[PDB]
Structure 1
Amino acid sequence: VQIDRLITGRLQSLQTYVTQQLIRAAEIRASANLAATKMSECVLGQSKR
């Protein structure tokens, strides 16, 4: 029972870490898409926006 209590506590921590990493990865992916749009429109051309 003590091992199950330790496994459950450490497993939920890894799940929270994975969820936070997913959220931060979505943020970084949005930023990278913005940078890729900015690379093609501002560097590879001239933007009227």
Structure 2
Amino acid sequence: LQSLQTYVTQQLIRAAEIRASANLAATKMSECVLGQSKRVDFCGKGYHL
């Protein structure tokens, strides 16, 4: 039971990080692909096309 509980806790902690990454990716898809971003270094290095 303790082994299973440890596994589930690390799974929750990893899922939080993956959700942060997915939220960033959705932001990038909205802002760099559906438009042109003035934010520097957000959509690559140099002025974004």
Give the TM-score taking structure 2 as reference length. Answer: 0.78
Alpha-carbon distance in structure 2 between the residues aligned to 1:45 and 1:29: 23
Q: Which has the higher contact order (CA 8 A, sep 6+)?
A: 2
Larger radius of gyration between Structure 1 and Structure 2: 1
Number of residue pairs aligned between Structure 1 and Structure 2: 39
Q: Percent identity?
A: 100
Structure 1 stretches of 4+ with a deviation exceeding 2 A read: none
Instruction: Provide the aligned C-alpha RMSD in A.
Output: 0.4
- The structure richer in helix per residue is 1
Q: List runs of 5+ in structure 2 lacking aligned partners.
A: 40-49
